[PDB]
Every structure is written in structure tokens, then in C-alpha cells.
Amino acid sequence: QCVKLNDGHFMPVLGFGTYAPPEVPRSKALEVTKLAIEAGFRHIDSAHLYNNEEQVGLAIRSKIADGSVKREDIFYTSKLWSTFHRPELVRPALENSLKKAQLDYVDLYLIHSPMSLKPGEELSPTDENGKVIFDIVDLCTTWEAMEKCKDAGLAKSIGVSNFNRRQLEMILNKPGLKYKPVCNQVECHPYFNRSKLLDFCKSKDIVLVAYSALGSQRDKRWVDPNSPVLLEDPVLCALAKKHKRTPALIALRYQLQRGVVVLAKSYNEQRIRQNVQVFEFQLTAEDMKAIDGLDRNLHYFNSDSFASHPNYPYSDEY
Ligand SMILES: NC(=O)c1ccc[n+]([C@@H]2O[C@H](COP(=O)([O-])OP(=O)(O)OC[C@H]3O[C@@H](n4cnc5c(N)ncnc54)[C@H](OP(=O)(O)O)[C@@H]3O)[C@@H](O)[C@H]2O)c1
Numbered sequence: 001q002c003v004k005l006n007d008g009h010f011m012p013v014l015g016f017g018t019y020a021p022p023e024v025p026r027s028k029a030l031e032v033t034k035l036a037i038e039a040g041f042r043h044i045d046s047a048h049l050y051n052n053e054e055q056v057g058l059a060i061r062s063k064i065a066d067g068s069v070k071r072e073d074i075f076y077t078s079k080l081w082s083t084f085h086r087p088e089l090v091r092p093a094l095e096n097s098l099k100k101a102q103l104d105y106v107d108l109y110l111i112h113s114p115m116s117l118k119p120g121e122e123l124s125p126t127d128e129n130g131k132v133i134f135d136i137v138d139l140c141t142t143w144e145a146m147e148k149c150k151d152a153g154l155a156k157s158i159g160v161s162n163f164n165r166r167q168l169e170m171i172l173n174k175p176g177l178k179y180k181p182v183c184n185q186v187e188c189h190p191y192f193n194r195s196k197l198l199d200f201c202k203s204k205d206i207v208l209v210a211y212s213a214l215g216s217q218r219d220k221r222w223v224d225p226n227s228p229v230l231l232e233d234p235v236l237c238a239l240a241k242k243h244k245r246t247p248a249l250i251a252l253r254y255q256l257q258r259g260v261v262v263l264a265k266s267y268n269e270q271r272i273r274q275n276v277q278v279f280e281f282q283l284t285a286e287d288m289k290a291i292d293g294l295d296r297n298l299h300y301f302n303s304d305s306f307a308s309h310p311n312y313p314y315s316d317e318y
């Protein structure tokens with residue numbers, strides 16, 4: 001149940017999403033990561049941004065200690081936050097994630113976003129007028145620092161997140177490149193299916209990893225409440241009824257059959273266990289075309305405050 005990455009390592013094709021908004025107590029991340037491993041999740045997606053790597057690492061430690069898994073059975077992802085793009089900050093940021101999680105390595109380290117921010121430990125640097133402070137960094141130099149993290153053994157694989165085709169090509173065409181990104185983790189669901197970007201990634205042996213594949217958590221700081229609810233889509237709901245599954249399972253299976261590695265966040269014990277049932281049924285070729293028809297170019301995150309960023313990913317066609 002894995003895909004082979006272009007560096008030879010293997011990534012489980014279903015991943016557990018661990019982000020929860022700050023109102024959720026941090027003990028929950030510990031509890032649900034254990035439930036996820038107990039349910040069969042082996043790929044766990046975290047990040048410095050999520051303020052939960054300590055709890056996710058504790059959950060992994062606990063399941064290793066009780067004999068449920070070994071460390072090599074777990075695929076753990078962290079991400080470099082955008083205030084750490086300057087190359088001298090990359091390894092210290094990774095080492096800090098490893099210390100928090102009490103891991104010797106991450107299986108995957110990503111550049112969280114191409115949209116560089118003012119360097120510092122402050123995650124949301126803002127000016128005297130409350131505006132986020134951008135930074136200008138050559139992401140090829142960030143990538144060179146990521147490559148050194150892989151050679152140092154601290155990350156088994158390295159990749160990117162929220163890149164568009166042009167930004168991927170900047171890395172791929174970098175002189176003296178040693179490691180291609182193994183993946184590009186991007187927003188991907190039936191209302192924003194990234195088919196052109198997926199075709200490009202396939203042509204370069206880069207895995208597309210889908211986040212907000214269930215339509216996001218609809219956080220009201222970020223999500224227009226008038227945006228359509230993905231899991232209420234009539235086509236998804238009709239397919240769920242036809243297959244005797246759930247709209248969530250349809251949305252996850254859609255990604256698996258188009259060669260996309262799919263993440264699924266749930267902090268609910270029964271939904272966690274439901275999502276691993278994605279492997280138990282199949283969509284027909286006609287089902288897949290019907291879902292392909294749902295694309296609305298819908299980004300669940302209101303990105304107006306970032307649209308002026310030089311590395312804003314959504315100005316290009318893809
Ligand atoms: N690289 C990035 O920039 C980036 C951005 C966004 C997300 N991510 C990663 O992707 C992960 C998931 O994306 P997401 O956080 O946007 O959430 P999601 O996977 O789109 O799921 C969204 C909501 O679906 C609900 N859900 C889960 N399973 C369900 C089921 N079987 N039936 C019905 N509802 C179900 C969950 O609510 P309950 O918890 O109540 O089940 C969750 O809040 C994140 O946790 C994070 O790891 C990365």
C-alpha cells in the first residue's frame with residue numbers, strides 16, 4: 001500500500017493529517033495519533049507550524065513501546081516553516097522539529113510553502129500596520145540546504161508543498177541539483193483536482209500529495225462560509241449511496257485511483273477508522289470521470305492577503 005519515491009524510499013499512499021486549530025487542546029493530537037496508528041495509518045503528516053510535533057512524536061513513541069509498530073513502519077512528515085527559508089536556518093529548524101518529536105530522523109521534510117516570510121521564530125511576522133512581512137529568498141538555496149539535511153541523515157526524503165509547475169521547474173532545472181523533490185503536497189479535492197499539475201508531476205516522477213482532500217476543516221478565520229461544502233456535493237453523495245460508502249471515502253478513493261497520495265485529517269475515533277476503509281472498494285472508470293467533472297477551481301483558503309506575494313502559487317494556469 002505504498003508508492004516508490006524517486007529516491008528509492010516508500011511512502012504509504014494514505015496519510016493521517018494532524019493539523020487542528022489552536023482551540024483544540026494539544027492532548028488531542030497525542031490521543032488521535034495513537035488511534036490513527038491503531039486503525040492502520042502508517043503515514044503521519046505534521047509540521048512545525050502545527051504546534052503538535054511533540055504530541056505526535058509521543059504517540060509514535062508510545063506505539064513503538066507497546067509493540068504495535070517499529071520506527072521503520074512509520075512514515076513521519078515534517079515541514080519547514082516559511083520564516084526559515086534562508087539556507088542557514090534550514091537545518092536548525094529541522095533539528096528543532098526532531099528534538100520536539102524525539103525522533104532521530106523524519107521520513108519526509110517539506111518546504112511548507114514557497115511564500116517566504118521575515119526570518120525569525122515568530123511564525124506570523126507583521127509590521128506596524130498589522131501586515132504580514134514577506135521575505136525574498138532564492139528557493140534554490142533553500143533546496144540546497146534541504147539536500148544537505150538528507151545527506152546528513154536527518155530527512156530520508158525531501159520535497160515541497162504548495163508549489164506550482166514553474167516553481168517545481170526552478171528546482172528541477174537548478175544547476176548541480178542532487179535530489180529532485182519526491183513530492184509536491186498541494187490542495188487537491190474534487191472541487192480543485194489539479195489535473196494539469198498532476199500530469200506534470202507524473203512526467204517528472206514527483207508524487208502529488210493531496211491535502212484538504214475532504215474539503216478542509218472550514219476554519220472560519222480562513223474559509224469563506226459561503227463556499228460549497230465538499231462532502232455535501234450531490235455527485236459525491238450519490239456515489240456514496242451507490243457504493244454503500246461515505247462521501248469522504250469516495251473523495252479519498254478518487255485520489256488513490258488517479259495516482260495521488262491522499263491525506264485525511266480526523267480527530268474522531270470512528271471517522272479515523274472509517275477512512276482506512278478506502279482500500280476496501282473501487283470506483284468505476286465512469287465514476288472517476290463523473291468526479292473529474294466537479295472541478296470548480298475552488299481554493300478553500302482565502303489567500304487575498306498573500307496574492308501580492310512574488311511566489312504566490314495561483315497566478316499561473318497551474
Ligand atoms: N501543506 C499544507 O499547506 C497543508 C495545508 C492544509 C492541510 N495540510 C495537511 O493535510 C491534512 C488534512 O487536510 P485538512 O486538515 O484540510 O482536513 P481534511 O483531510 O480535508 O478533512 C477535513 C475534515 O473532514 C472531516 N472528516 C474526516 N474524515 C471524515 C469522514 N470519514 N466522514 C466525514 N467527515 C470526515 C474531519 O473532521 P473530524 O476531525 O471532526 O473528523 C476534518 O476536519 C492537515 O491535517 C495537514 O496535515 C497541509
Ligand SMILES: COc1ccc2c(c1)c(Cc1no[nH]c1=O)c(C)n2C(=O)c1ccc(Cl)cc1
Binds near residue numbers: 047113187
Ligand atoms: C485549505 O486549507 C489551507 C490552505 C492553504 C494553507 C493551509 C490550509 C495552511 C495551514 C494548514 N492547515 O492545515 N495544515 C496546514 O499546513 C497553510 C500553511 N496553507 C498555505 O500555506 C498556503 C499555500 C498557498 C496559498 Cl495561496 C495559501 C496558503
